[PDB]
Each structure stands twice: as C-alpha cells, then as structure tokens.
Design a binder for this molecule. Sequence first.
Ligand SMILES: [Zn+2]
Ligand SMILES: [Zn+2]
Lengths: 413, 163
Amino acid sequence: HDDKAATETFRKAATLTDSLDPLLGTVTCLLRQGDMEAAATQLQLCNQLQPAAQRNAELSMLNAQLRWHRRGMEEETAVLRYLDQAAEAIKQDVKERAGVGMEVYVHLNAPVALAIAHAYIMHCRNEPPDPVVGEKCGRHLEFIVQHLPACMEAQLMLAKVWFVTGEVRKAQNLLKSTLIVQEQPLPDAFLLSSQICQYMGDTKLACQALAQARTLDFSLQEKPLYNLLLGTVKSAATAPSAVPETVTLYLQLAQAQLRVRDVDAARETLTEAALKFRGSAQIGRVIIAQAMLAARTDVDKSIELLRQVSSKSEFYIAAHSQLGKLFLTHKHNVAMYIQCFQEMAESVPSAQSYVELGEAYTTIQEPEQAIAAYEKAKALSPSSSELSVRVGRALVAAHDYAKAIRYYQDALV
Amino acid sequence: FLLMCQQQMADRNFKAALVLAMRLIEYDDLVAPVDGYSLIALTAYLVKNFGLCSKAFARLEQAERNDEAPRPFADLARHIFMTHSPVDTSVDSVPCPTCGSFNKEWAQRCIKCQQPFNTCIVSGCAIVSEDGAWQCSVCHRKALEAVVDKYRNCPLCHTPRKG
Ligand SMILES: [Zn+2]
Ligand SMILES: [Zn+2]
C-alpha cells in the first residue's frame, strides 16, 4: 500500500514491457488515489487487449472496482456479471493451471480472490431467513476455503455467510469454533452470533458476549456498531472526509432512534438519509422504519410511505407484511385488514401468505374462511405439513369436529 | 350495556340480550372478555342460535389454554357442539339507511359504505331511521321510541321529562 510511489513504478514497468497485468496494477492504485479518469481510460485499453475466450481475471475486477463506487448501484446486476466474469474464471483459470502449485497461486492472487468475497457480501443480504445470490456468495467462499482450509481471512467471510444458512445449530457451533481458536481477527461475529441466538430465543449467553468483544480493545467504539449491540440484549453516520455498509449503519441509526425516544432527530435523519439513499434498492425497509415510527406520528403518512414502494422491492411485501400489522393493535381495522391481506396474497402468492391470511381470518374469528385459507395453504405446498399441523389446530379451534376427523385422517394418509 | 344485558333474562325478552351482549366486543379493555363471552355464549344457547357462540367459546378456550400454561368450558363447548348443530342462524336483518346493504344488528359500521350507526341505549339495535330515534339532551344518547316510551326516565341519566 505504498500507492503513490509504486504508481510510477508500474508506469516504469508498463514502459519496460507493455503487458495487461502490470497496467491493471496502475489502474488499481489510481483508483485508491482518486484518478478515476486515468482508471477509466486504461480500463478501455485492457478491455481491447482482453484474451478472446479466457477472459483475464484482474481485468473483470478493474471493471467491477471502478464501476462500483458510482455505477455499481445501477450496475448491481451488471457489475455482478463482471464479478461473475472473473469469479468463475478464477474457479476455472486456476483449474486450467492445476497440478504444480506454482501455476495455481500465481493465477490465484488471493487478495484479488478475497476482494471478490468483499464485493459479493456487500451486494448480498444481512438478515437470516424465515422459520440464491446469498448462496452464490456462499458457494464461492467454500470454493476458496476447501483447497486451503487454514486461513482465517477466508474463514471469517465464510463464517459470516453461514448466518444466511438457517442451520442455526450447525452455524453457531461453527461461528463459535472458528472464533475461539483464531484470536487475531475482529470479534464482532461473536456479537452477531449471539444475536442470532437471541433471535431464536437463546438470550442467556448474549449478555456475556458483549464483554468478549469489549475485552480486546476500546478501538471497537470507533465503530458505533458495538454500542448499539451492547444495548440490544440489556458524527460517524454523516461521514465526511474527517452504500450497504451505510445501510447497516442506518439500521444502527434506526434502532438507536428507537431506543433514545428522540422524535425530531429520528425524523430528521429519516428525511435526510432517505433523501440521500432514495436511489438504493433498500429504502422500503427505511420507509417502513419510518412507518414503525410514523404510527406514533401519523397513520396516513405511514400508509402513503407504504404506498411509496413498488412490487420490484423484496421488502415491499414485507412492507405490506407490516402494513397489515398496522391493523393489528392500532388501526384495529377489519375490512381494510382483509383487503390488504387479500392484496398481498394475490400479489405474491405463497403458502405462508395463505397461512397468514388464514391468520387474518382468525383475527376476525371467521371459522370457515380460516379453514379455507389454511386449506389452500396446505394445498399450495406439500412442504406445509408443519403448517398442516396449524391447519388442524385452527379447524379444531373452529368447532368442526365432524370434519376435523376427516381432515386428520386424510392428512395422516 | 352489562346491566340490562344481564337483567334481560329477568325481562324474559331474550332476543335483545344477544344484541346487548355483542356490543361489548370493543370494550374488552374495560371489562375482561372472559366476563362478557360467558354471557354471549349463554344467551346464544338460550335462543338456540349458534355461530357467534362458536367464536365466543373459541376465544374463551384460548384464554383457558393461556391460563393453564382441568377446565370446564372446553367440556361445555364440546358438549354443545356435538349435541347440537353449530351453524350460525340469520344475523343480517337490518339494511343500511344509506346504501341499502344488510348489516349485523350489532354492527357499529356498515359492511359496505362504512358509515357508523348510533346504537339503541336499551335494546342495542343500530338505528336506521331518525324518525323512530329519540335523542337525549343531557347524556347525548339515542334510543328507539317503542322502548323509550315504556321508560319514563333515560337508562343512562334518568333525566326527568320537562312539562
Ligand atoms: Zn352502508
Ligand atoms: Zn339520557
């Protein structure tokens, strides 16, 4: 990282022999320094010098590196292709040069190969599933880890995406096993692991996990991440030179302004960050955070915010999943509640929707409609036998003891 | 509602007892639902109708299962549901004065146009015509003429009639 002096060294080395690889070394360090213009111009040259079939590995990175800062949000798919263009190539061009290890690691360039995992994770989700690009993030890491299982740097990104797995028992052991043996890296996975345990319901150890991160240093507090996670169990966000990373920072801000009970500051950072992060593909979560506060401010403004998201957002149905929740204990609506759950049931059909709309019919104590919605939840998925238990419980709660016997016998068949 | 809902059995006109009893659903915070749903199921049985009794028994038994975590309301629910047909009788017998939509006698709003109705203070039926609606000038309540003619005083304030 002697970037400025070695930048001329590449320019000497590129003049000594004009080759694509050391030229891309010049583009890499110019990106760190800020000369995106010289970074973009020579990206064109290396694109023209591209080998026709076996596309060069570091070439696709300098495609993905330059575009990520500005075009990467708009190229969240396109740069991911440029990610895939070399990610499979490093899977393959190294495999083309296997056998003798000297060819393996020279085309590996693990700092480039680990930068793929750095690029992939910020493109991927941060939240566990319910009771593919995430797996695509997860597949390439186990590809990196399998050949050389010792390295903790590749382990930590692997141990991270094990949060997406949903095998919570097998994960939290692996999260614990790798963190205790290897002590040098950052411990923030310890907090995140215990918060998954609290997310399941295992809270007793989560109080002690806070101290475990705190044990090594006070330097964690330079990240405001810890202080919130400290308070979970029991200047920085503005960021001038003094996006999904900032989205996690915005989750920190959201729960902070949840706990502090500040109204004006919460709404002011909602407006400001929503203005700055409107173009992001996550603002729906942001606005429903607004909605989760706007219930204490104005119901109708919250409903308008809920209507400010289209069906292209993955959180949008989640938005409606909480918009229906707006009629749970505050609106106490009946007709509007049934309307909303029908809308989200037809918009994105699933067994779970066919379950929770059934829940809607249990909210209004209509037996037959709850029976029907749970029956089509059973019909939608053969993977609804665990939900078929709930179907049976709802129908016996719906006094249909004559047909309860028949439903149970057929389900047992 | 609770006083005349309970004494309606003494008044022997058990039809209005359900109309009174199905008005305390929104008042579950002030009076615990285990208190009112017992009366709701009791007056549902006494007029031999069902459907609403199924909902009341379901909520009562959910409360009991919350409590234990030997209950006789499960016994009563199962006994009645197996010894009688648990199907709701006719419940839509009043049309909306605005859009003509037939609604529940205990409905606080229209099921179609969503317009609230003032409820009778003694019988509990939603008033559809203001001609047969008597407005009290003291407690600011409304009732029906055919029942308020019998009572010389208001059921709420007992305001004497000026003459
Ligand atoms: Zn109407
Ligand atoms: Zn009065």
